[PDB]
Amino acid sequence: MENGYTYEDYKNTAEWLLSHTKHRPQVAIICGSGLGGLTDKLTQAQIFDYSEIPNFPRSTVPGHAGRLVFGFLNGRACVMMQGRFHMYEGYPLWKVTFPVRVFHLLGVDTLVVTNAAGGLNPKFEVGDIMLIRDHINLPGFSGQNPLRGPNDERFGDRFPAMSDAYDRTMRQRALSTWKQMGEQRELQEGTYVMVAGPSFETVAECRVLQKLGADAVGMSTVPEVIVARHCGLRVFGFSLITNKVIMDYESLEKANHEEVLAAGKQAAQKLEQFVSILMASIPLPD
Amino acid sequence: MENGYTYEDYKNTAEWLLSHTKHRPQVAIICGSGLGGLTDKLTQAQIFDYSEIPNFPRSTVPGHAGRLVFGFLNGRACVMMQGRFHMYEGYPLWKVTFPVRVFHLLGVDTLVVTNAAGGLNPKFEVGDIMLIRDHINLPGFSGQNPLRGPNDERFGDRFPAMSDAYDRTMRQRALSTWKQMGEQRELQEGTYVMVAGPSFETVAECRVLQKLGADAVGMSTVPEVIVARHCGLRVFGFSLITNKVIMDYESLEKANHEEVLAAGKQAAQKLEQFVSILMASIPLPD
Amino acid sequence: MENGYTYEDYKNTAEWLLSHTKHRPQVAIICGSGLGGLTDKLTQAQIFDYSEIPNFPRSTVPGHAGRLVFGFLNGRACVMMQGRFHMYEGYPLWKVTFPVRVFHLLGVDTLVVTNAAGGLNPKFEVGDIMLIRDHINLPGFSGQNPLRGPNDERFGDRFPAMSDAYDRTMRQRALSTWKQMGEQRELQEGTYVMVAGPSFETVAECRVLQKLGADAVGMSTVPEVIVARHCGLRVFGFSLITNKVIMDYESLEKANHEEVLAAGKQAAQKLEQFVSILMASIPLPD
Numbered sequence: 001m002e003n004g005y006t007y008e009d010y011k012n013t014a015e016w017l018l019s020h021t022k023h024r025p026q027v028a029i030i031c032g033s034g035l036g037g038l039t040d041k042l043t044q045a046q047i048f049d050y051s052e053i054p055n056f057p058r059s060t061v062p063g064h065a066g067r068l069v070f071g072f073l074n075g076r077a078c079v080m081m082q083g084r085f086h087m088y089e090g091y092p093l094w095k096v097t098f099p100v101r102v103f104h105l106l107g108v109d110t111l112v113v114t115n116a117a118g119g120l121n122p123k124f125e126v127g128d129i130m131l132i133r134d135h136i137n138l139p140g141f142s143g144q145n146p147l148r149g150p151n152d153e154r155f156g157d158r159f160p161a162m163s164d165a166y167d168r169t170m171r172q173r174a175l176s177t178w179k180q181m182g183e184q185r186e187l188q189e190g191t192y193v194m195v196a197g198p199s200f201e202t203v204a205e206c207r208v209l210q211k212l213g214a215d216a217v218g219m220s221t222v223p224e225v226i227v228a229r230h231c232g233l234r235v236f237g238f239s240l241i242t243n244k245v246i247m248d249y250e251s252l253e254k255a256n257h258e259e260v261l262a263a264g265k266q267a268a269q270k271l272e273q274f275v276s277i278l279m280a281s282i283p284l285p286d
Numbered sequence: 287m288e289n290g291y292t293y294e295d296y297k298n299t300a301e302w303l304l305s306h307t308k309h310r311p312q313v314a315i316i317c318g319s320g321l322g323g324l325t326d327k328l329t330q331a332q333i334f335d336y337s338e339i340p341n342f343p344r345s346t347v348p349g350h351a352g353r354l355v356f357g358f359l360n361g362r363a364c365v366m367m368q369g370r371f372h373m374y375e376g377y378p379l380w381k382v383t384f385p386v387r388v389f390h391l392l393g394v395d396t397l398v399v400t401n402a403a404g405g406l407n408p409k410f411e412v413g414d415i416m417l418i419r420d421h422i423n424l425p426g427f428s429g430q431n432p433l434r435g436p437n438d439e440r441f442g443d444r445f446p447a448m449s450d451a452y453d454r455t456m457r458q459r460a461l462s463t464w465k466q467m468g469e470q471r472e473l474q475e476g477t478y479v480m481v482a483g484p485s486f487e488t489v490a491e492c493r494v495l496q497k498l499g500a501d502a503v504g505m506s507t508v509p510e511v512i513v514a515r516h517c518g519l520r521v522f523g524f525s526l527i528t529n530k531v532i533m534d535y536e537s538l539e540k541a542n543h544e545e546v547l548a549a550g551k552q553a554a555q556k557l558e559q560f561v562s563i564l565m566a567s568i569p570l571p572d
Numbered sequence: 573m574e575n576g577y578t579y580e581d582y583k584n585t586a587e588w589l590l591s592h593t594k595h596r597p598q599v600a601i602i603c604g605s606g607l608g609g610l611t612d613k614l615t616q617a618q619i620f621d622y623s624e625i626p627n628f629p630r631s632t633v634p635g636h637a638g639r640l641v642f643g644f645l646n647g648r649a650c651v652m653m654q655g656r657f658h659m660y661e662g663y664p665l666w667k668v669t670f671p672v673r674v675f676h677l678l679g680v681d682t683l684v685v686t687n688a689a690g691g692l693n694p695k696f697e698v699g700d701i702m703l704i705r706d707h708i709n710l711p712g713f714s715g716q717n718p719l720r721g722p723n724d725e726r727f728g729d730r731f732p733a734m735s736d737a738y739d740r741t742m743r744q745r746a747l748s749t750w751k752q753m754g755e756q757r758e759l760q761e762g763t764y765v766m767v768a769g770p771s772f773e774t775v776a777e778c779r780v781l782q783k784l785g786a787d788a789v790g791m792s793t794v795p796e797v798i799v800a801r802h803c804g805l806r807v808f809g810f811s812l813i814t815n816k817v818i819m820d821y822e823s824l825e826k827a828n829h830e831e832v833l834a835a836g837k838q839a840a841q842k843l844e845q846f847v848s849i850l851m852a853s854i855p856l857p858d
């Protein structure tokens with residue numbers, strides 16, 4: 001197998017965007033789940049549907065793939081993805097992560113990634129926000145790693161390290177912002193495990209993931225982080241705990257998408273505020 | 287990637303079978319290992335070789351794939367698969383599970399799945415029968431999930447839950463049937479872990495699987511269950527423990543297919559009886 | 573999916589080599605990392621670039637793939653691979669392991685495999701040599717097993733056992749050779765876990781692998797061993813611990829390829845000596 005994209009392809013997509021907007025972003029934000037509305041806070045906003053952009057992964061109905069929104073968020077020149085690609089949809093990881101390498105060639109230096117996740121840590125509660133300190137890449141252990149294939153030194157090394165993936169400094173700076181918001185619940189912090197999905201975990205599977213030392217489980221993010229780190233980006237991310245994974249056989253409740261989207265809706269304002277203030281804490285370049 | 291089968295394909299296979307038999311099955315039974323002989327107890331039996339049926343996964347020698355046998359088992363209108371597809375044979379999971387979606391469109395409402403499995407729980411003994419209370423889908427954590435790809439709402443939801451996969455009621459009703467048979471060994475119950483195989487586990491691997499909380503290990507079943515649950519089927523299943531996985535380096539014994547097939551032969555009568563009586567306990571439809 | 577190679581292909585590659593060298597090897601050595609120099613100790617050495625050999629997996633620049641070197645090492649007729657294929661490079665496992673089946677048809681009866689590995693056992697130290705007593709095949713649990721696909725009985729069984737993969741006798745005989753060398757550090761022994769890579773593990777991932785009972789982690793070897801065992805070869809192998817995997821968040825150190833290659837260089841002489849003496853301990857055939 002190999003990444004279907006040549007270096008020329010990524011460059012071509014970046015050149016195209018560079019020619020169609022005067023915006024020059026520094027921060028890329030992948031808006032996870034129930035956080036799409038964050039583009040409503042950008043100023044000077046210029047929207048591009050993924051369907052218009054050369055080389056972007058395609059959805060059957062071209063528009064449901066989503067859009068890149070360039071603008072300014074609380075001082076920072078941003079590009080936000082509203083709509084992301086998941087491997088459970090059938091995309092190979094070199095398509096899932098194609099935009100990350102584009103952001104880099106646009107001059108982005110920081111990637112913020114967010115998602116919704118199921119809570120594995122028994123102390124977490126629906127609505128909780130968990131900052132991501134580390135991840136467990138289960139698909140990557142098996143060969144599903146976005147860097148599989150010939151390496152291009154123009155982006156990075158053959159064997160990049162991931163032990164420092166999540167910027168220590170901005171997890172610190174985010175603990176600050178949280179007190180400034182004056183919040184009842186404390187800001188959670190922990191390990192995110194990626195599983196492919198799309199079906200939800202069984203009880204026995206949830207117990208496995210808890211014993212691996214994971215705090216939250218979702219179906220995305222890890223690959224983007226790996227590709228970000230590989231090309232030099234600073235990374236910060238968090239998960240909204242939208243549900244507490246079922247851990248025992250007596251329970252008569254089940255994980256469901258409606259309940260995940262509901263939690264998304266509730267935590268919407270909190271999240272957009274949270275991310276907007278944090279922009280000020282991202283270092284300026286140079 | 288995507289499922290090579292369109293909704294039309296599944297419908298076409300179901301329409302074909304519906305036109306070639308007057309039998310209308312309610313229960314699908316996937317006969318696992320050393321339980322093929324169960325078709326000898328059907329009455330009014332009509333056999334179809336997989337090679338004759340449109341869209342069915344193909345074996346090199348078309349006949350070795352197996353056959354669908356329609357009939358009546360102790361009162362219930364059944365369709366049994368004698369011969370199944372495994373991912374270790376090279377089939378993608380959307381081929382492995384193609385028949386499950388066909389059963390559904392035939393009007394089946396219940397799936398019974400059986401298999402042979404290696405015992406991980408140290409109390410299990412060769413010959414033991416373990417009812418399946420839950421599973422650990424290791425291939426699915428990595429992306430090998432039969433629902434990967436665009437979802438079709440005609441079968442089910444994008445994100446189906448699996449925590450309730452194994453019908454509580456019929457595990458209860460099966461504990462009954464077992465006492466009615468008056469058996470020496472108790473009916474075992476536990477967690478089935480799927481690994482792809484086809485080679486057998488090492489000692490270090492067996493210890494891993496034991497520590498994941500698995501009781502039995504095999505190379506099948508999970509995907510069919512996921513697809514069953516996804517389209518609304520009730521599911522019950524069990525494993526014949528054909529061997530006790532080697533757990534220490536001193537042992538000079540090794541897992542082997544001859545010994546697995548032997549255990550299959552011994553437990554043959556016990557199994558066919560067990561499943562036949564249980565049919566009476568499957569609710570009627572409506 | 574299926575193995576792209578027919579039995580004829582393997583036979584054709586073996587016949588070709590058999591026609592182009594008078595050497596008839598008994599022992600195959602896959603030279604892992606910083607152990608390529610071992611070909612400098614062969615006598616009567618005949619080199620074949622992988623690019624010249626029919627059916628050999630191909631590298632973009634044909635020469636960077638490596639070479640087969642036939643010769644005599646301390647008494648034994650050997651064939652050594654200098655350069656190997658990894659799944660993180662994009663090769664399917666039936667390409668990674670193609671040479672193993674060729675060795676067999678050349679008449680090889682023993683496979684020695686070596687590699688560099690990250691230390692998970694906290695007692696190991698950089699420079700340590702760990703003999704491999706067992707392995708955990710994480711990719712294989714998910715379907716990435718070199719035997720996936722139709723089985724060819726000419727090489728072996730559908731379901732080969734792996735619990736006895738690493739020859740008990742020569743791990744014993746290697747403990748000997750080590751004292752004969754008069755070494756300060758003791759010869760380590762333990763479990764090798766394969767992960768696909770190519771990126772390095774996170775802290776949370778390292779803790780997972782430690783709790784699986786693994787002592788060393790690398791990105792190769794397991795598949796070759798599985799295919800070796802499947803066709804009847806005796807197998808012995810070891811890992812050079814080139815680094816101690818980062819296990820806590822305070823550490824400011826990171827795994828890196830330079831440091832791995834450095835450790836390789838240091839342990840070079842020790843390794844070539846170690847393997848050369850050991851040849852005398854490999855049983856003669858017949």
Ligand SMILES: O=c1[nH]cnc2c(C[N@@H+]3C[C@@H](CO)[C@H](O)C3)c[nH]c12
Binds near residue numbers: 245445
């Ligand atoms: O319990 C969970 N298990 C795995 N993933 C999730 C997620 C992340 N979801 C997974 C998927 C279903 O809403 C959507 O792509 C975002 C929330 N809860 C859970």
Ligand SMILES: O=c1[nH]cnc2c(C[N@@H+]3C[C@@H](CO)[C@H](O)C3)c[nH]c12
Binds near residue numbers: 319402487505531
């Ligand atoms: O020890 C085991 N490990 C994994 N699978 C099995 C099975 C299930 N088998 C696996 C395979 C070998 O008989 C056949 O497809 C049914 C029995 N014993 C074991």
Ligand SMILES: O=c1[nH]cnc2c(C[N@@H+]3C[C@@H](CO)[C@H](O)C3)c[nH]c12
Binds near residue numbers: 658
């Ligand atoms: O810390 C580690 N994690 C995983 N693999 C390795 C290896 C084996 N390496 C992996 C790769 C990087 O040097 C090369 O193919 C040989 C050494 N150290 C580690």
